[PDB]
Design a protein around this ligand. Structure first.
Ligand SMILES: C[n+]1cn([C@@H]2O[C@H](COP(=O)(O)O[P@@](=O)(S)OP(=O)(O)OC[C@H]3O[C@@H](n4cnc5c(=O)nc(N)[nH]c54)[C@H](O)[C@@H]3O)[C@H]3OC(C)(C)O[C@H]32)c2nc(N)[nH]c(=O)c21
Length: 187
């Protein structure tokens, strides 16, 4: 039997998709829910095609895609010393860019797009918010300047962002202890 004709295409990592819905009745951790996991190309698309586009979520929702075993929270062992490359969208870009950026971000993750530094990647998060949406790739160590910088440059190019745009990298330790947070790095 030729495996090319019937086997699914395994991804390098198993990934977990999480959903968050704002409910002021509950703690933030209590609002976070794991949706399902996948570790093949075919199961990724089955999941993606089943769920709402980010642009159709009510305000205050997040999606997070993280490597299996890493919860999408600062407190996780693999995030607490890490940080994130932040894409900040204005209100008009929810129409133009939110969904295509998020899908490109998903592919950067599952397709292992950062060469040897894809091991520093933990996951990605999209925040759907009335004041402006955000997409971010989370990495495991905010001090690994080489890995962080490589991921930032590849990511910015893969999104198609012009050089008129600067994106910033922020430590979670800064984000947790704080409206805005300083950048450690920019590309
Ligand atoms: C990624 N992450 C986000 N959060 C929480 O989400 C909020 C993140 O705030 P930040 O300013 O960094 O992001 P952003 O601009 S997208 O704000 P947001 O719209 O998510 O929240 C706006 C406000 O709304 C309130 N909020 C947000 N989420 C919740 C929530 O789930 N439950 C309640 N009761 N209130 C909430 C809170 O007052 C917050 O300041 C913080 O709110 C509280 C509940 C104080 O904890 C923070 C986190 N908390 C923990 N412990 N760990 C995280 O990884 C983490």
């Amino acid at each position: 039997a030729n495996p090319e004709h019937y086997i699914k295409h395994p991804l390098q990592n198993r990934w977990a998709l999480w959903f968050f819905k704002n409910d002021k009745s509950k703690t933030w951790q209590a609002n976070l829910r794991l949706i399902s996991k996948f570790d093949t190309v075919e199961d990724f698309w089955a999941l993606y095609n089943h769920i709402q586009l980010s642009s159709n979520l009510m305000p205050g929702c997040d999606y997070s895609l993280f490597k299996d075993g890493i919860e999408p929270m600062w407190e996780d062992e693999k995030n607490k010393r890490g940080g994130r490359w932040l894409i900040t969208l204005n209100k008009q870009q929810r129409r133009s860019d939110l969904d295509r950026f998020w899908l490109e971000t998903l592919l950067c993750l599952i397709g292992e797009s950062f060469d040897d530094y894809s091991d520093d990647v933990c996951g990605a998060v999209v925040n759907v918010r009335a004041k402006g949406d955000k997409i971010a790739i989370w990495t495991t160590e905010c001090e690994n300047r080489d890995a962080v910088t490589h991921i930032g440059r590849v990511y910015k190019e893969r999104l198609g962002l012009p050089p008129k745009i600067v994106i910033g990298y922020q430590s979670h330790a800064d984000t947790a202890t704080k409206s805005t947070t300083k950048n450690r790095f920019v590309v």
